């Protein structure tokens, strides 16, 4: 009666592949890295430049 | 001041440069500050309105 | 605390023999300990994971020989 | 009988009101801690008096 | 109320020139920026019925 | 999701020399602004927190 | 090892209906012979341990 | 001073990619699976088969 | 109505194993939403009625 088992649903147990069942999987694939936006400038029409 | 032990493995695992990530966020941070500066002096140097 | 997960085995008692039972026992196990050692099959149970231990009998990260004696105790036949 | 398996996920940066994630390996399953009332993407308003 | 206003300014070219131990000066480090890279993990849950 | 348990990273740009630290400000944060003088006078002298 | 921290699996062939269990005899083990009636009489009746 | 950090050398902290430094890596990758060898038969020349 | 006594059937989609029974809920009901864990977690345990 081989049980497939699940991860604990814990965040650590998954990242390790640790599984209550028989098999311990490799790892949690990758769905890709999310970065944070780079914010916008007000430009300079508000103030004279004069390099 | 990033680290030499980092760029080796971070390039191995994530493929990112770990340099152009810092040079990207410093050169961007000096601009986002020099832009938030000349907005701050507008708000700083402005008379109180509705007065 | 276990800090990871709790696999919760609830055995359901039954009449094995004349005027005898296999006592159903609510028990909880720290998930890493559970995946390492569990003897439960054919034991008339049902299991679910939970972030906190869902039964009053709790086994933390480190017991081992204390737990190894508890799971095989799920088969204890009492009258 | 039928069986399906899906699973749900939460957008990292969901909260975005916090400069740091906790624990740095953090379940993306919606839970009371991370996902309850904390998504910055969804803003809910109970309208009364209709 | 205008009591406590909000500014952004520069760095005097006398201080910025010698910065972090030049010309005998000391105790005045530069400011730095890092990056972080933390991860998340999800799990698949099941569902099912009968007739 | 092809294999169970996806995962997704997140790159926080964190400044102050400690990418992972207690209460280390995030760099480009849509909510919170860039600290106006950080590159600037903020690096030359330490300004007293307002309490 | 190209990327840090390789990992190696191991597949134990375990018999007794519970792949992961306390003292679950491994199936094909160079040390230990197979219990010669497991398939056989040992499944029909239970033989008492020797103590 | 962005530090690369290490896995704790703990067995879980590697398989989860948890890392004391900035970056939490993907995971261990794989070095391949190790199975257990099947034992050898003595064949039948020692006992008359006689189907 | 071409002949006395018409008749009209009605197919209730009723769930819970008893096509006819006491208060067995109808499946696709314009009023009542489908109980969203019935297939799901709701079949693993019985959630305590709220009273």
Swiss-Prot record, chains A, H:
A proteolytic cleavage by the prohead core protein protease gives rise to the mature major capsid protein during virus maturation. It comes from the Viruses. Major capsid protein that self-associates to form hexamers, building most of the capsid in association with pentons made of the capsid vertex protein and one dodecamer of the portal protein. The major capsid protein self-associates to form 160 hexamers, building most of the T=13 laevo capsid. Folding of major capsid protein requires the assistance of two chaperones, the host chaperone groL acting with the phage encoded gp23-specific chaperone, gp31. The capsid also contains two nonessential outer capsid proteins, Hoc and Soc, which decorate the capsid surface. Belongs to the Tevenvirinae major capsid protein family. Homohexamer. Interacts with the portal protein. Interacts with the capsid vertex protein that forms pentamers. Interacts with hoc; one hoc molecule associates with each capsid hexamer. Interacts with soc; this interaction reinforces the capsid structure. A total of 960 subunits of the major capsid protein forms the 160 hexamers. This is Major capsid protein. The gene is gp23. The chain holds residues 66 to 116 of 521 of the full protein.
From Swiss-Prot, chain C:
The keyword Magnesium does not apply. Coiled coil: none annotated. It comes from the Viruses. It is found in: Virion. It holds the Pfam family Soc. Its main location: virion. InterPro entries: Soc, Soc_sf. Keywords: Capsid decoration protein, Capsid protein, Virion. One of its GO terms (cellular component) is viral capsid, decoration. Capsid decoration protein which helps to stabilize the capsid against extremes of pH and temperature. Once maturation and expansion of the capsid has occured, trimers of soc attach the interfaces between the hexamer of the major capsid protein. Acts as a 'glue' between neighboring hexameric capsomers. Dispensable for the head morphogenesis and phage infection. HAMAP family: SOC_T4. Homotrimer. Interacts with the major capsid protein; three soc molecules associate with each interface between the major capsid protein facets. Belongs to the Tevenvirinae Soc family. This is Small outer capsid protein. The gene is soc.
């Amino acid at each position: 009666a081989e049980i497939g088992g699940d991860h604990g649903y814990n965040a650590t147990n998954i990242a390790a592949g640790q599984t209550s069942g028989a098999v311990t999987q490799i790892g949690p694939a990758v769905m890709g890295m999310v970065r944070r936006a780079i914010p916008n400038l007000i430009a300079f029409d508000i103030c004279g430049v004069q390099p | 001041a990033y680290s030499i032990e980092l760029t080796q493995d971070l390039r191995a695992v994530h493929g990112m440069d770990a340099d152009a990530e810092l040079s990207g966020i410093l050169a961007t941070e000096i601009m986002l500050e020099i832009n938030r500066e000349v907005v701050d002096w507008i708000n700083y140097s402005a008379q109180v309105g509705k007065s | 605390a276990s800090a990871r997960g709790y696999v919760n085995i609830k055995t359901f008692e039954q009449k094995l023999d004349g005027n005898k039972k296999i006592e159903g026992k609510e028990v909880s196990v720290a998930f890493p300990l559970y995946s390492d050692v569990h003897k439960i099959s054919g034991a008339h149970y049902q299991t679910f994971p939970s972030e906190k231990a869902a039964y009053s009998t709790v086994y933390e990260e480190n017991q081992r020989t204390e737990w190894i004696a508890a799971n095989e105790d799920l088969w204890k036949v009492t009258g | 009988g039928f069986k399906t398996r899906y699973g749900i996920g939460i957008n990292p940066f969901a909260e975005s009101a916090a400069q740091a994630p906790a624990s740095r390996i953090q379940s993306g399953m919606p839970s009371i801690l991370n996902s309850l009332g904390k998504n910055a993407y969804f803003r809910r308003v109970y309208v009364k008096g209709i | 109320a205008g009591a406590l206003v909000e500014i952004a300014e520069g760095m005097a070219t006398s201080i910025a020139e010698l910065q972090e131990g030049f010309n005998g000066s000391t105790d005045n480090p530069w400011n730095e920026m890092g990056f972080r890279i933390d991860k998340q993990v999800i799990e698949a849950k099941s569902r099912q019925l009968k007739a | 999701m092809n294999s169970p348990t996806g995962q997704v990273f997140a790159l926080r740009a964190v400044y102050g020399k400690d990418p992972v630290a207690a209460g280390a400000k995030e760099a480009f944060h849509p909510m919170y602004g860039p600290d106006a003088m950080f590159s600037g006078q903020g690096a030359a002298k330490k300004f007293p927190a307002l309490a």
